[PDB]
Design a protein around this nucleic acid. Structure first.
Ligand SMILES: Nc1ncnc2c1ncn2[C@@H]1O[C@H](COP(=O)(O)OP(=O)(O)O)[C@@H](O)[C@H]1O
Ligand SMILES: Nc1ncnc2c1ncn2[C@@H]1O[C@H](COP(=O)(O)OP(=O)(O)O)[C@@H](O)[C@H]1O
Ligand code: BEF
Ligand code: BEF
Ligand SMILES: [Mg+2]
Ligand SMILES: [Mg+2]
Lengths: 417, 417
RNA sequence: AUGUUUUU
């Protein structure tokens, strides 16, 4: 008796099971209400019920166990967590809790937690003694997260160009700067697919705030990982809540020496949401940005770091420029002094239908020698010195024509000499 | 005895009928008052009266049935809908209701609804069980909505250029960016005529907010569809109300697997209206735009989506640029990074009296391979690569001179090779 | 109202 197991079951089988259990007509009923009635009827027989979810401690002291399939939205099937157990096990926002639950009695509206069985997918004896995320020693990117497929596919050209322009390692904090209508969607899809193919052990999390739902359901059915999104039909409060829950879960996972990867596509939208939810202080800067509005996105971005004791946190955010709004322009670069990695995309190259439209000149990675060998770094330096004199479109055409001849970049580097 | 039937009748015949029924002199009376008196006299004999309209639920709990011929304006002949029936049939704003009505008794001012016969042009048993619009899975444009006439007319050149620049499919969410005095009116008229000619099965709705009455009555007598407009003589409150009613009706139609097409021509004017009706919060951004003013137009724009279960919602809005106001430059923009189709028009080409004055270079459609075949996409790519080096005016002249030689674009593509 | 917008 698990909550996620009943959530994954279809509607027809749940209706059939409820009709066999002998309850009210479930055809004219919601799936969540059907599951609730089935759990009630199964607990009336004396059997136990189990559930799971991410903890969201409220300001009063209690909390609930949000579900991932609903993008951490307030649902009727949330498991109530008393503050006594929180104080007894030192629980915090983001801790994954899995234990026995019971249906609400007369006068209650949510399931109660009796005994916790597993904390953060581990024993509670290992979670009671742990080092906080704020005390971990940061470090630079040491492990190399190669994005090249290696299967010789035609779509691998984007990953090869990305590796030649800006290699990505564990704990990297980069930025994907690109004007609208440049190809950010396809680039993010390719990055997510390459991460899921090359490094399936890492925890991939794609955050899409204030996006077109069709794109949400497309990304959810395309990438092999977790997708937490919030369409534009929701207020900025839900955006802030989702961002906080995601970053808290990422911190709790990193605290257990896990490799978390966050592919953010709405850093600008997140900053707009934070500027909308912040109370007015009577002081407005140039472009309509509050003085204390960028602090929360600043911390959300800076949360990414590489841990020496174990694990890492990678955050790749895509910033929006040339959107016609001065607020986004002020945000983007305020954040430019940030992202230890900038991958610029050119609109002029995208208009020529030359995919990918990557600005190789302005791209780059700091401390790239820690992720590449000596000969590889020398070859990349020679390639950059050869590409720099040529124009952007000409350099992109040259790179595409030279990478189409071979499958691996090593052969291209060997033929360049 | 139908309301719309009496509304379509002329004034002279209604006056004659009222004089034959033996009532007060109807020559010095309004047509609506004449219809009201005729309905009263006909109901005094014991016969039944029927009406219809779009439901507009008020904040208190009751509602009225607005009429389409009055642009959903508050009229004396609105049918009152009690909240009891709303609670009994789960009615919402936008549901088309058609049932028996009765004249108001002593102390009443509006017609009452006794029994509902048809809901959303369908049986109530099919409307009681339905999936909300917020739960439908979005998708990209799959079905091709070809705009080419095919009759070899001289006006078909605009549709041919539009198809070669940006093909339109079901569920598309585009933008027509053009400075003033460019030819937006003729272009919108041609688009509406091509939609009514090629795809007469789709529900066409043209929304004109804050425009001149002459243009309104011109569009109403030119296109073959529904025209809901609101001239500048009305406050922004009526603009917001009309936009809400139109989008709610569109959502209710899409919920019944219908293909709705909305040709918006005032996205900038709608954003200005929303910025005017929003209460001041003491925080003004660059250009005079409120922080929470663009949220409602953002949702109105993002409502457009393609449904996998059935139906679609297409919204083609025309944004205004270079109007001398910085608010529109932020308002029209901020919207640039939202849609997935931009059809730019050049003022320099319009000054040369070269119609249509379309910027073929900056135009385009994302995921265009889902609406065109392989050979068609290759021919469009070759045409774009040939047109790109030439200047805007030169490319437009070349395209016009090459399309004037033949009737179909297939012959042009075959002759280009 | 200052900042924002004006504004480069
Ligand atoms: N690698 C690519 N190959 C082919 N087309 C692409 C590629 N990247 C982008 N595009 C085209 O650009 C359009 C928009 O790209 P997108 O990633 O949505 O840009 P952004 O996210 O910056 O708005 C897509 O619909 C696609 O047709
Ligand atoms: N396809 C066309 N053919 C001929 N003249 C046109 C065409 N499109 C626009 N025009 C001219 O431009 C004028 C204004 O066009 P309009 O569509 O009103 O531009 P906008 O809507 O951008 O203000 C029209 O009065 C018309 O004379
Ligand atoms: F319009 Be893109 F997604 F920035
Ligand atoms: F003056 Be146009 F209608 F934009
Ligand atoms: Mg995008
Ligand atoms: Mg116009």
């Amino acid at each position: 008796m698990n909550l996620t197991e009943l959530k994954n079951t279809p509607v027809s089988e749940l209706i059939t099971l409820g009709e066999n259990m002998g309850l009210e007509n479930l055809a004219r009923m919601r799936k969540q209400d059907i599951i609730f009635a089935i759990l009630k009827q199964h607990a009336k027989s004396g059997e136990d019920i189990f559930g799971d979810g991410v903890l969201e401690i409220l300001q009063d002291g209690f909390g609930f166990l949000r579900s991932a399939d609903s993008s951490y939205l307030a649902g009727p099937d949330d498991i109530y967590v008393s503050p006594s157990q929180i104080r007894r096990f030192n629980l915090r926002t983001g801790d994954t809790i899995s234990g026995k639950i019971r249906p609400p009695k007369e006068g209650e509206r949510y399931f109660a937690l009796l005994k916790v069985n597993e904390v953060n997918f581990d024993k509670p004896e290992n979670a009671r003694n742990k080092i906080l995320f704020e005390n971990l020693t940061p470090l630079h990117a040491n492990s190399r997260l190669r994005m090249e497929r290696g299967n010789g596919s035609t779509e691998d050209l984007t990953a090869r160009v990305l590796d030649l322009a800006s290699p990505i390692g564990r704990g990297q904090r980069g930025l994907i700067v690109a004007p609208p209508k440049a190809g950010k969607t396809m680039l993010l899809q390719n990055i997510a697919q390459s991460i899921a193919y090359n490094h399936p052990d890492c925890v991939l999390m794609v955050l899409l705030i204030d996006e077109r739902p069709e794109e949400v359901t497309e990304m959810q059915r395309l990438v092999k990982g977790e997708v937490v999104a919030s369409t534009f039909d929701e207020p900025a409060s839900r955006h802030v809540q989702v961002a906080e829950m995601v970053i808290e879960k990422a911190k709790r996972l990193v605290e257990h020496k896990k490799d978390v990867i966050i592919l953010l596509d709405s850093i600008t939208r997140l900053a707009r949401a934070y500027n909308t939810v912040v109370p007015a202080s009577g002081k407005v800067l140039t472009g309509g940005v509050d003085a204390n509005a960028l602090h929360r996105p600043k911390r959300f971005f800076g949360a990414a770091r590489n841990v020496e004791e174990g694990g890492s946190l990678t955050i790749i955010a895509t910033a929006l420029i040339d959107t016609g709004s001065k607020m986004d322009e002020v945000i983007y670069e305020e954040f430019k002094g940030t992202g230890n990695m900038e991958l610029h995309l050119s609109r002029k190259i995208a208009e020529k239908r030359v995919f990918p439209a990557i600005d190789y000149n302005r791209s780059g990675t700091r401390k790239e020698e820690l992720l590449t060998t000596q000969e590889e770094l020398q070859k990349m330096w020679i390639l950059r010195k050869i590409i720099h004199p040529m124009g952007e479109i000409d350099a992109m055409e040259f790179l595409i024509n030279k990478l189409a001849m071979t499958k691996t970049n090593d052969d291209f580097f060997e033929m360049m000499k």
